[PDB]
Design a protein around this ligand. Structure first.
Ligand SMILES: Nc1nc2c(ncn2[C@@H]2O[C@H](COP(=O)(O)OP(=O)(O)O)[C@@H](O)[C@H]2O)c(=O)[nH]1
Ligand SMILES: Nc1nc2c(ncn2[C@@H]2O[C@H](COP(=O)(O)OP(=O)(O)O)[C@@H](O)[C@H]2O)c(=O)[nH]1
Lengths: 420, 278, 330, 420
């Protein structure tokens, strides 16, 4: 079934714009959505097929206090995305309240696309955590979608924000987003501003314009995470299939990222694999261990080599895995696209469930716990107090996220077979 | 020669320890798939991943080891043997007779490399530490490191330059078969593999060396986790070593690249004159 | 070879054979399994071939399969099997790809028969995996509305772990078939065929690709014993499909009434806690015996694949036991 | 067996900067760390392998009150060394105290590299004894490393300070460094400023800019001491094997240096060996005797000749040593690298355990003993007094180094079987 992407908030809209543009050039599409004359791919899932042959994306664009939504409109690609579905604070509470009054018109825009498509498998949100308007509005829309579509699944390309710690309420906003995300999202793929900023400092000298350049980094991961679906293959020919192996237990659904040629700008499979397990290739910042690992490779890969490449990674014992029941590294192969450069003829990505990401969640919980005692930034803005007089959703969120922090470390232990 | 005469030791440093934890186990308890994957991996890891025929090496076992040669349960450094694959074209020069002996050369040369690093490992653990050990370990190490500088730089690279030279100036394939068997018999005989009693005295020296490192490492582990047990072993081991070291030089002085061994083993006149035989 | 390559296109028929009769496209098959569930689950003794043909037509239009030469797209046809007694459409349904003309000499009556055995196997373990993904669709799609109830999680957790362990075994075997029976065999066939000159090297070689798949898969008369044990796993998967649902429509049933019990308020639910506290032990022991039975079969299966040839059994055994969860006395 | 080098202090940072640069040109590496297009070596131990062949040295650069760490950064080779691991008095006590507050972040930088590498054979330290900041910080870091990594062996290419005797506390600083170095260092390679300055006066007219030119001399020895490791050879690939033979007794862990063509800018093996045993080729400034010796060669060397050459020095007896042991000498032949000049087609050095180096240790102990009585420079700086009110570590150091001075001369005697 076709995937509908609910890109929301200024930050989320910017990564969402970069992702559709990335699949514009990668696929046979021009800036006016017209089939390219120069042009073997499954474009049905991501791109609606129009009567003018415009490959309109199934993308929902939500604007709040719009500034970067106006810049998106003055672009050569304005015609490419024309489902004609764009509808008009820095606080999580401020975003949640604004979303509630306009919920029905934004929700009808969701319906239109659902009716238009032959079918709708899942919702993929370019969400921004502690995103000012992006968070709060995104949590609320996350709660409505599951109730209306119980059968359908929700994924979130959360750009978890770590900038070395401006938002003084950033921990409070993030705390609330996760509670909704832990109980109302089937999958989540985690990214980190600092981890990518550190990569940007590593691969390039770019430091001050970190947000503009890092977009491209987020994009390469986001196009890549879907390439097995966007191009046909013998296995993983549906979104849920990739999502099943990566998230074993319903509560623990946060996925780490990595890319072998971060500098993609021959290499044997045996090599692109080990390069990935190394921690410079990772883009995320008591014993600790992965729960299950998966990898996808797109290039000139001897199909025969992968049958022995898995054994090669097994001998180096580079990775420590889960201890209760069985789990294993999974090897997958896809086709690099023609037209665009074939540099780094072999180039890979990995999506993995790792207990280290618990540490990033605890750091915002640490900032919040410190901030909660001080009550330095309760906002006490009438919106904040009137929306939350008890201020007990933050405590409800604190216990829910602490259960998650606990559940992760329980995973490390030998008895997750017992309740965790 | 890259895998049989150990010119590429880069590969051996990486391969040795990566398989050793398995090698220390005895036979019938060792899985050829595990060793095969480990060598297959080590070969990719080494800087020697540029040779076209690298795939040929295969891990096989030598039954009875040097005993079959004119315990079997013992394995690891003990039962390791490489084997190389050749098709009909060049099989006619590099054959069973040729590769039975290249392997038999590599095997003896493996122990000298393996037990030199076991003596090196016991010296790392020690880094109050009575010197009883430091006297005997300095004796064995300076004796062996010198056997391996004689074997690799007094016999092998010498004769191999004879083979590469004469195979450049043959004009027939019954004369190339002459040089190939000529180089191989020369390196086998000039080296101590060719002795009437086959230098079992060298084997007895290597048995006391391994027994020394075993207990010495075990004791240093035991004391961490005093001389009535340690210095007792130190004195007896040093006394048996000095006896066999002198027996080796004495039974090698009877022969007359002949004395370049003993003249070197006592370089700067150490133990050069101790006891004149008879 | 120049006039059979163009006028009769032996090249395009063997190229698209992998794609459609060996599930090489996959997309087409997953779309086909999606639309063709209700008729196949229904006893097909009432079903007939015309309905299957018509659904396949629109199914081809749905997938990128329609973007191909019309001739190969037309040759494919649904084939009924013997109408097995007391059966469901799932047990008796296989594509044929009827072929006639000069291309017949390369693809003979012996060739289409051996492909149908491959298809009989691949349909079973392409469904059984799409059944376990429905299971995980359900476990994810039922727990998201039971976030209020704290009493259930315990039996719910025991159902999730066994479901996860099952997905580890079938999903990995799916990869072993993907890259160690249908990628290395096809690579071997292609190079030996496209470098050939005598048409006699294309026949006696193409049969080798065929007679190597039947031995790297378990369809040979000798690997049949290991398939017989594999059937038990292919049984225990749908066994959980009946163990899982029978609990929710019973457990979830009380929750709907609890909303209606409070909608009455807007002592009966103390007797519902009574049926809960007596139902937890029986469900617990039933699921426990299921996990032990599954462990007892999968461990005997892994110890069943001891070396006979080792050409294709060592690279699956490693895959099923990676991380040494098994062979460490489980 | 990847080996990390902990280059520390301004003087130590100067010789690590050059040593890595020397292996940049010698190996196939450019100033940006990129594989050279013009380019058979074992670059694995010394150089980390990045995905796009950016072979980055595993250098740990420690700075303190930085000035020349800034000049290292403004260089064409700044990109070549980018593990992105550089972290911000003339007294030994002043250096030791500064190191203690920052010990955990500098130690995490050690951990990162240890985790990143497949394995860690050893650590290499570049520093000057009485190096102001370099000493004291270097002694403290020497003590932490052995406790954390007992297996790991730390080797310091010590820049022992001999300038004809400005630092008025130089003997006190050096005295303390050796006590740590005698009990907490697995091996030490000794070099001398005066010995090299005398060589500089001999080979060249350079006198006033002694430090800049002598850097090249220390480098040629440093690159050379590792060449058996950096290029595969029949024996001496591992660092442990290379050193163990040189030091027979743990305590006597100090090695002497020499180079046959000091003016490397044909020659038979018989010649290059005799030349080395002569004392002009040596770079270090009652009977006395080398404990054990061993020769290193890299050039167009015939293989039949070295044995005749070994036998020649046996008859020449140019260098004399008489340990009660049979330590004798060892031989080594290695490949000179292509690309760089092949001048002095046969070029080599010698490492020699010698009891003469005891005399250099006693001379600083002599300056210190004279200085201790006067108490002319007790510093009495509050850092010095507060850190050391008893001033008894200097006396603890004096007995430990005197034991070392005694042990050496005991080695000369016929009975080092009995305690020396
Ligand atoms: N990855 C990425 N994140 C961004 C970018 N711009 C902003 N952000 C993130 O967006 C968050 C704040 O959202 P904001 O832009 O204030 O939303 P607004 O309230 O609609 O302006 C911060 O946590 C930033 O890390 C970008 O270009 N890339
Ligand atoms: N070999 C060598 N030694 C140097 C050089 N520069 C300084 N030194 C030595 O460094 C020691 C003093 O260290 P110093 O430079 O004071 O370290 P600082 O405290 O960081 O300035 C003296 O003993 C000098 O011999 C150099 O370029 N080469």
């Amino acid at each position: 079934r076709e995937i509908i992407t609910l890109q929301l908030g200024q930050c989320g809209n910017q990564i969402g714009f970069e992702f559709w543009k990335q699949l514009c050039a990668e696929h046979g599409i021009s800036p006016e959505g017209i089939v390219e004359e120069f042009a073997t791919d499954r474009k049905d899932v991501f791109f609606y097929q129009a009567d003018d042959e415009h490959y309109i994306p199934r993308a929902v664009l939500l604007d709040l206090e719009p500034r970067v939504i106006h810049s998106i409109l003055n672009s050569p690609y304005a015609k490419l995305y024309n489902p004609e579905n764009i509808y008009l604070g820095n606080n999580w509470a401020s975003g949640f309240s604004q979303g509630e009054k306009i919920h029905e018109d934004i929700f009808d825009i969701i319906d239109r696309e659902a009716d238009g498509s032959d079918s709708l498998e899942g919702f993929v949100l370019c969400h921004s955590i502690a995103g000012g308007t992006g968070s709060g509005l995104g949590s609320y829309l996350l709660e409505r979608l599951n109730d209306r579509y119980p059968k359908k699944l929700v994924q979130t390309y959360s750009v978890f924000p770590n900038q070395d710690e401006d938002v003084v309420v950033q921990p409070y906003n993030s705390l609330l987003t996760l509670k909704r995300l832990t109980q109302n999202a089937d999958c989540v793929v985690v990214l980190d501003n600092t981890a990518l900023n550190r990569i940007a400092t590593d691969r390039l000298h770019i430091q001050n314009p970190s947000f503009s350049q890092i977009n491209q980094l987020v994009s390469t991961i986001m196009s890549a995470s879907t390439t097995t679906l966007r191009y046909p293959g013998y296995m993983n020919n549906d979104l849920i299939g990739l999502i099943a192996s990566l998230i074993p237990t319903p509560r623990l659904h946060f996925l780490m990222t990595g890319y072998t040629p971060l500098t993609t700008d021959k290499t044997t499979v045996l090599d692109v694999m080990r390069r990935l397990l190394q921690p410079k290739n990772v883009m995320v910042s008591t014993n600790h261990c992965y729960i299950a690992i998966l990898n996808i490779i797109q290039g000139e890969v001897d199909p025969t080599q992968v049958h022995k490449s898995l054994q090669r990674i097994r001998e180096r014992k580079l990775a420590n895995f889960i201890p209760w029941g069985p789990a294993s590294i999974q090897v997958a192969l896809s086709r690099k696209s023609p037209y665009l450069p074939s540099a780094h003829r072999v180039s890979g990505l990995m999506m993995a469930n790792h207990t280290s990401i618990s540490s990033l969640f605890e750091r915002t919980c640490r900032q919040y716990d410190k901030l909660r005692k001080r009550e330095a930034f309760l906002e006490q803005f009438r919106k904040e107090d009137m929306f939350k007089d008890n201020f007990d959703e933050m405590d409800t969120s604190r216990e829910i996220v602490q259960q998650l922090i606990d559940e992760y470390h329980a995973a490390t232990r030998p008895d997750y077979i017992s309740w965790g | 020669k890259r895998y049989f005469l150990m010119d590429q030791g880069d590969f051996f440093v990486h391969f040795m320890d990566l398989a050793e934890e398995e090698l220390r186990k005895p036979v019938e308890d060792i899985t050829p798939p595990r060793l095969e994957a480990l060598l297959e991996l080590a070969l990719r890891m080494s800087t020697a991943n540029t040779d076209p025929f690298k795939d040929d090496l295969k891990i096989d076992l030598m039954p009875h080891d040097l005993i079959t040669q004119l315990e079997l349960a013992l394995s690891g450094l003990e039962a390791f043997s490489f084997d190389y694959i050749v098709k009909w074209p060049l099989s006619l020069i590099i054959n069973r007779k040729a590769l039975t002996r290249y392997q038999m050369l590599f095997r003896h040369m493996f122990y000298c490399k393996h037990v030199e690093r076991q003596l090196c490992s016991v010296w790392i653990s020690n880094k109050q530490w009575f010197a009883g050990a430091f006297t005997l370990r300095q004796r064995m190490l300076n004796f062996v490191q010198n056997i391996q500088y004689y074997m690799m730089f007094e016999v092998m690279e010498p004769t191999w330059h004879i083979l590469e030279k004469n195979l450049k100036s043959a004009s027939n394939i019954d004369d190339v078969l002459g040089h190939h068997t000529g180089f191989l018999d020369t390196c086998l005989k000039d080296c101590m593999l060719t002795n009437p009693e086959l230098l079992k005295v060298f084997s007895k020296l290597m048995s006391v060396c391994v027994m020394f490192t075993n207990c010495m490492q075990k004791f240093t582990q035991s004391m961490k986790l005093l001389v009535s047990g340690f210095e007792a072993t130190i004195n007896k081991f040093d006394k048996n070593f000095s006896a066999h070291l002198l027996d080796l030089l004495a039974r090698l002085s009877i022969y007359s690249g002949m004395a370049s061994v003993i003249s070197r083993l006592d370089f700067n006149g150490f133990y050069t004159e101790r006891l004149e035989r008879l | 070879l120049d006039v059979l390559n163009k006028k009769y296109s032996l090249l395009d028929h063997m190229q698209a054979m992998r794609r459609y009769l060996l599930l090489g496209q996959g997309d087409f098959i997953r779309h086909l399994m999606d639309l063709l569930k209700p008729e196949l689950v229904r006893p097909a003794t009432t079903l007939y071939q015309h309905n299957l043909t018509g659904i396949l037509e629109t199914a081809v239009r749905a997938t990128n399969a329609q973007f191909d030469s019309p001739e190969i797209l037309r040759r494919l046809d649904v084939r009924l099997l013997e109408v097995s007694p007391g059966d469901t459409g799932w047990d008796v349904f296989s594509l044929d790809y009827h072929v006639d003309g000069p291309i017949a000499t390369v693809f003979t009556r012996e060739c289409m028969s051996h492909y149908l055995r491959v298809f009989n196997f691949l349909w079973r373990a392409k469904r059984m995996e799409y059944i376990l993904t429905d299971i995980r669709k359900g476990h994810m799609c039922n727990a998201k509305l039971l976030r209020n109830m704290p009493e259930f999680s315990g039996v719910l957790h025991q159902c999730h772990i066994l479901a996860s362990e099952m997905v580890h075994f079938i999903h990995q075997m799916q990869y072993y078939i993907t890259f160690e029976v249908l990628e290395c065999s096809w690579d071997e066939l292609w190079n030996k065929v496209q470098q050939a000159q005598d048409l006699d090297h294309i026949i006696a070689a193409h049969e080798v690709f065929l007679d190597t798949i039947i031995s790297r898969c378990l369809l040979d008369s000798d690997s049949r014993a290991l398939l017989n044990q594999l059937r038990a796993v292919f049984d225990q998967i749908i066994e959980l499909q009946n163990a899982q649902d029978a609990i929710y429509r019973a457990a979830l049933e009380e929750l709907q009434r609890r909303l209606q019990f409070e909608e009455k308020k807007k002592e009966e639910e103390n007797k519902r806690i009574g049926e809960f506290k007596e139902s937890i032990p029986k469900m617990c022991s039933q699921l426990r015996i299921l996990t032990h039975f599954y462990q007892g079969i999968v461990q005997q299966f892994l110890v069943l694949l001891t070396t006979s040839s080792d050409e294709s059994l060592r690279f699956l055994s490693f895959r099923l036991d990676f991380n040494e969860h098994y062979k460490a006395r489980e």
